[PDB]
Amino acid sequence: SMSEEQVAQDTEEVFRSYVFYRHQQEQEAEGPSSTMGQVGRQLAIIGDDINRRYDSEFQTMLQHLQPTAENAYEYFTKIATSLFESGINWGRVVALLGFGYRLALHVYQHGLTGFLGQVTRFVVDFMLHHSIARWIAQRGGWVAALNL
Amino acid sequence: EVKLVESGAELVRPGTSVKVSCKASGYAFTNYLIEWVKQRPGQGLEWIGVINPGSGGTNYNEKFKGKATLTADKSSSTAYMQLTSLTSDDSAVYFCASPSLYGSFDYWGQGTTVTVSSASTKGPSVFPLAPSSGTAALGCLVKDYFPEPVTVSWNSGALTSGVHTFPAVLQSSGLYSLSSVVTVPSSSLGTQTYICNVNHKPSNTKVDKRVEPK
Amino acid sequence: DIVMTQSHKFMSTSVGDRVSITCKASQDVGTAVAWYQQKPGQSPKLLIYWASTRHTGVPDRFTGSGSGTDFTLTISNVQSEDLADYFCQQYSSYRTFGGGTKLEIKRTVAAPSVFIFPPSDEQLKSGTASVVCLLNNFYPREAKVQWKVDNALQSGNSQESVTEQDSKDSTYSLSSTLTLSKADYEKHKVYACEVTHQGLSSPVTKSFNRGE
């Protein structure tokens, strides 16, 4: 079965592939060979009106209050908690990945410091401590995100 | 593929300024950072600073603030590093690199050698180190040349076993000197001629010197 | 400044064995640590990032471990292409590198072969005198060379150069060059080169008599 920890381990590859494919699409618009890599890619491509709205919110707040390498954990905890205060669905889980991507990107591009390894640990620790990983585990794991 | 190609070697006098370039290809120059690293002869690695070519934002090692100025040209996809008030301590190899989103330096340039000296380009003087002596040792003293490099071959390439061409040392005069030694059986002293071939292309001096037993 | 300390500048291994290079940070850097290999004349190459993640194209025999302050690069089944320099690095906002660790091949102790070369007469015409002493094919790179002119110990007039380990012998060679003025060279008779080394039971002196 999908354990809570198996979801946590799989989250590293899912988030890495998600960040890779989101950055690639963002660079093409500017001008996998793994099961978790396919999940990451399928979640990176989805462009409904809620995720596009989520991204607009993530960008605006980051442009207003630029995150630093020293506040990023508290910055992450606030928005990630805000995303699962009403409940837990796949749309909010994807927005979590989306915010993790915009957070790592802003610290890299504005703070001149690579932070993907730290934001990845932020996402994994948050999903572990705030029941998001077990919510995914009950649905058979990250593989359930493939066929929405 | 992802390539970082830096400018050619720089040889300048103290108190001057040099500007090293770092040409990027095979990726989006505006979306990745450019790191700069300094490596002193025989020493380790020292981080200088980083720039975001898209935003032109810069952070520096506090030691290099006011010494190194990092710029970037988006049109040419080239980063630049300007060093001012050059001294002997600035003589080193300068690498440019581009990090991944994690921060590790994934792609490196070939390296630009900056040499700060007041000495003038000079050809070496080649003096024999004669054998006398179960094995015998002989060599050539390649003295008072600038700049590096110099190449030494023995018997036009026919002799390579036992050859030790020592790394040059820098003398108080600002000139380089090294010894190229080879060991041979003492019986060979009279069965073979030993000629060291010294090429110093920066001065276009070529010298062959026969090392005869005394 | 964050200080990455590689406590061992040189490490002796053998082909087919495993070697671990330690790196201690002066602060907690989490897992934001990278390992680089550098070979002479070449740019450094990334081996491990994220403390433990192998970079693309890196052989399976390279593994990294650690978190916080202590980080270790372990090379299983050491090959000959692995003999190189290895730098740890923390890539926080102000990036710093470790001092590096040079990998060498383990070998039995080899006493050096000591040769002394008096100044050539062609150089003596030019006005200077160089006295060269050779230490040939010794394994422990630790070597001591003492210059004695008329049994008087010299200081500050000798420059040393050492070669890197031989591909086949696994030994090192060292040259010590005593530089003297022509006039000073002719004011003295006995020029000796004393060599101290682990392989030598006693220090060995090689001497010549000027004009003899």
Contact between residue C131 and residue C180 where contact means Cβ atoms under 8 Å apart: yes
The 3-class secondary structure across B155-200, one letter per residue, is HHHCECCCEEECCCEECCCCCEEEEEEEEEEHHHHHCCCCEEEEEE
Counting one residue from A and one from C, how many pairs have CB atoms under 8 Å apart?
18
Q: Which residues contact B114 (CB under 8 A, 6 or more apart)?
A: B9, B10, B12, B18, B20, B83, B86, B90, B91, B92, B93, B94
Residues C159, B102: C-beta atoms closer than 8 Å:
no
Task: Compute the half-sphere exposure of residue C18: CA atoms within 13 Å on the CB side of its CA.
Answer: 10
Residues A114, C91: C-beta atoms closer than 8 Å:
yes
Q: Does B104 contact chain A (CB < 8 Å)? A: yes
Burial class (CB in 10 A: 0-12, 13-18, 19+), B44: middle
Q: Which residues contact C22 (CB under 8 A, 6 or more apart)?
A: C6, C7, C8, C70, C71, C72
Residue type, C122: E
End-to-end CA distance of chain B: 59
CATH superfamily of C113-209: Immunoglobulins (2.60.40.10)
Q: What are phi and psi of B189, to 5 degrees?
A: -55, -35
Dist. CA B27–CA C174, nearest whole Å? 46
Contact between residue C143 and residue C197 where contact means Cβ atoms under 8 Å apart: yes
Residues B127, C179: C-beta atoms closer than 8 Å:
no
Q: Binding site for Zn(2+): which residues of A?
A: 125, 129
Experimentally, how was this structure solved?
X-ray
CB-based burial, B71-96: b 16+ in 10 Å, e otherwise: ebeeeebbbbbebeebeeebbbbbbb
Burial class (CB in 10 A: 0-12, 13-18, 19+), A97: buried
* Per-domain boundaries in chain B: 3-116, 125-210
Separation in Å, CA of B75 to nearest CA in chain A: 14
Pairing status of strand B57-60 against strand C53-54: unpaired
Assess if CATH 3.30.950.10 describes domain A4-145: no
CA angle B200, B201, B206 (to 5 degrees): 55
Q: Does B2 contact chain C (CB < 8 Å)? A: no
Q: Does C161 contact chain B (CB < 8 Å)? A: yes
User: If residue B79 lies in a helix (H) or strand (E), which one and from where to where?
Assistant: strand B78-83
The 3-class secondary structure across C68-118, one letter per residue, is CCEEEEEECCCCHHHCCEEEEEECCCCCEECCCEEEEECCCCCCCEEEEEC
* Short-list B139, B121, B85, CA closest to B201: B121
The percent of chain C in helix, strand and coil, each rounded to the nearest 5, is 5, 50, 45
- Cβ-based contacts of C49 with chain A (< 8 Å): 117
Dist. CA C61–CA C48, nearest whole Å? 11
* Per-domain boundaries in chain C: 4-105, 113-209
- Sign of the torsion angle spanned by Cα atoms B47, B64, B41, B122: positive
Angle between helices A116-129 and A72-83 (to 10 degrees): 40
Taken as a whole, chain B contains a residue count of 214
DSSP category for residue B53: T
Number of CB atoms found within 10 A of residue C142's CB: 11
In whole angstroms, how large is the CA radius of gyration of chain A? 14
Q: What is the CATH number of domain C4-105?
A: 2.60.40.10
* Short-list B11, B200, B171, B39, CA closest to C40: B39
- Cβ-based contacts of B50 with chain A (< 8 Å): 112
Q: What is the CATH number of domain B3-116?
A: 2.60.40.10
Q: Looking up tokens 């392989």, which residue turns up?
A: C199
Separation in Å, CA of B135 to nearest CA in chain C: 9
Residues A112, B102: C-beta atoms closer than 8 Å:
no
* Short-list B125, B180, B42, B128, CA closest to C175: B180
Segment 14-73 of chain C within 8 Å of chain B by CB: 32, 34, 36, 43-46, 49-50, 55
Chain A: partners with 3+ C-beta pairs within 8 Å? B, C
Q: Does C96 contact chain B (CB < 8 Å)? A: yes
CA B36 to chain centre: 17
Q: Which residues contact C59 (CB under 8 A, 6 or more apart)?
A: none
User: If residue A128 lies in a helix (H) or strand (E), which one and from where to where?
Assistant: helix A116-129
Chain A interface, best mutation among C28, C93, C94, by max A CB count within 10 A: C93
CA B60 to chain centre: 25
Dist. CA C79–CA C58, nearest whole Å? 13
Q: Does C134 contact chain A (CB < 8 Å)? A: no
Contact between residue B189 and residue B211 where contact means Cβ atoms under 8 Å apart: no
Chain A interface, best mutation among C29, C49, C50, by max A CB count within 10 A: C50
Cis peptide before B149 (omega within 30 of 0): yes
Separation in Å, CA of B193 to nearest CA in chain C: 18
Picking from B54, B58, B100, the nearest residue to A114 by CB comes out as B100
What residues does B138 pair with on adjacent strands?
Answer: B182
End-to-end CA distance of chain A: 20
- Cβ-based contacts of A117 with chain B (< 8 Å): 102-103
Q: For chain B, how long is the longest CA-to-CA vector? A: 71
Assess if CATH 3.10.129.10 describes domain B125-210: no
Contact between residue C15 and residue C80 where contact means Cβ atoms under 8 Å apart: yes
How far is the CA of C103 from the CAs of A12, B33, B80, in angstroms?
33, 31, 34
Q: Looking up tokens 């040409």, which residue turns up?
A: B23
- Tell me the two tokens of residue C187: 């004011």
Taken as a whole, chain C contains a residue count of 212
Q: Does B39 contact chain A (CB < 8 Å)? A: no
Picking from B102, B108, B125, the nearest residue to C126 by CB comes out as B125
Dist. CA B176–CA C49, nearest whole Å? 39
Q: Binding site: which residues of A?
A: 125, 129
Residue type, A24: Q
User: If residue A29 lies in a helix (H) or strand (E), which one and from where to where?
Assistant: helix A4-30
Which three-class secondary structure state does DSSP give residue B21? strand
Dist. CA B50–CA C195, nearest whole Å? 48
- Cβ-based contacts of B150 with chain C (< 8 Å): none
Which three-class secondary structure state does DSSP give residue A83? helix
Residues C30, A121: C-beta atoms closer than 8 Å:
yes
Q: Does C173 contact chain B (CB < 8 Å)? A: yes
Dist. CA C61–CA C63, nearest whole Å? 6
CA angle B55, B60, B63 (to 5 degrees): 165
Q: What is the DSSP string of C166-201?
A: PTTT--EEEEEEEEEEHHHHHT--EEEEEEE-TT-S
Dist. CA B32–CA B52, nearest whole Å? 7
Residues C31, A113: C-beta atoms closer than 8 Å:
no
Q: What are phi and psi of B164, to 5 degrees?
A: -125, 105
Q: What are phi and psi of A37, to 5 degrees?
A: -75, -35
Dist. CA C129–CA C118, nearest whole Å? 8
Resolution of the deposited coordinates, in angstroms?
Answer: 2.4
Separation in Å, CA of A5 to nearest CA in chain C: 19
- Cβ-based contacts of A117 with chain C (< 8 Å): 30-32, 49-50
Which three-class secondary structure state does DSSP give residue A34? coil
Q: Looking up tokens 């390992």, which residue turns up?
A: C35
Query: CA torsion, points A68, A74, A75, A78, in degrees to nearest 10?
Result: 180
Number of CB atoms found within 10 A of residue B201's CB: 10
Dist. CA A144–CA A137, nearest whole Å? 9
Q: Which residues contact B187 (CB under 8 A, 6 or more apart)?
A: none
Residues C30, A118: C-beta atoms closer than 8 Å:
yes
Chain B interface, best mutation among A109, A113, A115, A118, by max B CB count within 10 A: A109
Q: Does C97 contact chain B (CB < 8 Å)? A: yes
* Per-domain boundaries in chain A: 4-145
- Cβ-based contacts of B55 with chain A (< 8 Å): 109-110
